[PDB]
Amino acid sequence: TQFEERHLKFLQQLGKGGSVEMCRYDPLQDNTGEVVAVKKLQHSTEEHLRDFEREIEILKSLQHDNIVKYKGVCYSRNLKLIMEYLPYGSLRDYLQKHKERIDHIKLLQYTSQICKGMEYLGTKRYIHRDLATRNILVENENRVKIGDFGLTKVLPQDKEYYKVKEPGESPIFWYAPESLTESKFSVASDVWSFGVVLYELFTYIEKSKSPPAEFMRMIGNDKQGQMIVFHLIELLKNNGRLPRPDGCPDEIYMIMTECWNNNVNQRPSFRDLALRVDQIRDNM
Numbered sequence: 001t002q003f004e005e006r007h008l009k010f011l012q013q014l015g016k017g018g019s020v021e022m023c024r025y026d027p028l029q030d031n032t033g034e035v036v037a038v039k040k041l042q043h044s045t046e047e048h049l050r051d052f053e054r055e056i057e058i059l060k061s062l063q064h065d066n067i068v069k070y071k072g073v074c075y076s077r078n079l080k081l082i083m084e085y086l087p088y089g090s091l092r093d094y095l096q097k098h099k100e101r102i103d104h105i106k107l108l109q110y111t112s113q114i115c116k117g118m119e120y121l122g123t124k125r126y127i128h129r130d131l132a133t134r135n136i137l138v139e140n141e142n143r144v145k146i147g148d149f150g151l152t153k154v155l156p157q158d159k160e161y162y163k164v165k166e167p168g169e170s171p172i173f174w175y176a177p178e179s180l181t182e183s184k185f186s187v188a189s190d191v192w193s194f195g196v197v198l199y200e201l202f203t204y205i206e207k208s209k210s211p212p213a214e215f216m217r218m219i220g221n222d223k224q225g226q227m228i229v230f231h232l233i234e235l236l237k238n239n240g241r242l243p244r245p246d247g248c249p250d251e252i253y254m255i256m257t258e259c260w261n262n263n264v265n266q267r268p269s270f271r272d273l274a275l276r277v278d279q280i281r282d283n284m
């Protein structure tokens with residue numbers, strides 16, 4: 001079923017990736033249409049549009065409780081991706097709003113769900129490359145979803161990693177060492193990122209304890225540009241890690257540090273992590 005240009009009514013800006021907007025699809029003109037989320041490119045050029053195209057094929061092929069629902073495409077050659085509107089917004093902002101009102105068993109509900117979405121994403125040999133709580137969204141109290149795939153890559157047939165030859169924006173404070181030195185991206189480096197996401201959850205996304213704040217302190221605030229990359233590689237090669245979050249129980253911190261293993265072979269699988277997290281939840 002089609003989405004006509006003329007019947008997308010702008011409601012609100014939501015954020016920058018493209019840009020993401022809240023719209024009413026109102027083909028009946030009485031404002032009874034569904035509210036949806038629209039992703040559109042900001043500088044649609046032949047290279048970047050092919051990317052957005054590949055990304056849409058990625059999302060459309062993904063069907064899971066914890067991945068945002070693809071709804072359709074809007075044409076005029078210029079693309080608007082139409083997605084379900086998840087009413088509780090960005091997980092990053094939701095955790096900040098309901099600070100400590102969210103207890104440990106609830107944060108583990110969220111952990112488990114993120115984890116399952118990643119495990120499933122692995123069965124199609126996709127690599128997120130951008131797992132971070134500002135790419136997680138909230139549907140309701142009981143339900144979060146991976147909400148963006150702008151940087152996802154597909155594994156090549158014969159390799160278990162992907163080389164990104166000329167990187168664009170790079171969320172380096174979420175990056176595994178091998179990604180930093182070599183641009184090698186794999187399920188295992190998504191696991192590293194998941195560990196950092198677990199860190200984010202348990203700090204309640206308090207900005208003074210965020211990963212960029214914390215690594216910068218460790219390497220010195222006087223580090224700038226490419227020097228940050230150099231020193232972060234060194235720091236991590238020597239087991240410099242994010243601290244245990246304040247109030248974070250032993251066994252959840254344990255999980256993070258297994259994710260942050262320098263040896264890629266020895267990081268856990270998303271399959272084990274989902275079992276592990278659910279075991280803990282039931283124990284509590």
Ligand SMILES: CCN(CC)C(=O)[C@H]1CCCN(c2cc(-c3c(N)nn4cccnc34)ncn2)C1
Pocket residue numbers: 014015016017020037068083084085086087088089090134135136137147148150
């Ligand atoms: C992960 C989306 N993204 C692209 C990389 C962002 O940059 C977000 C970070 C910053 C905050 N921002 C939003 C998105 C939404 C929202 C939503 N409510 N539903 N939805 C369905 C698909 C997509 N995004 C939404 N809500 C609030 N803030 C965009």
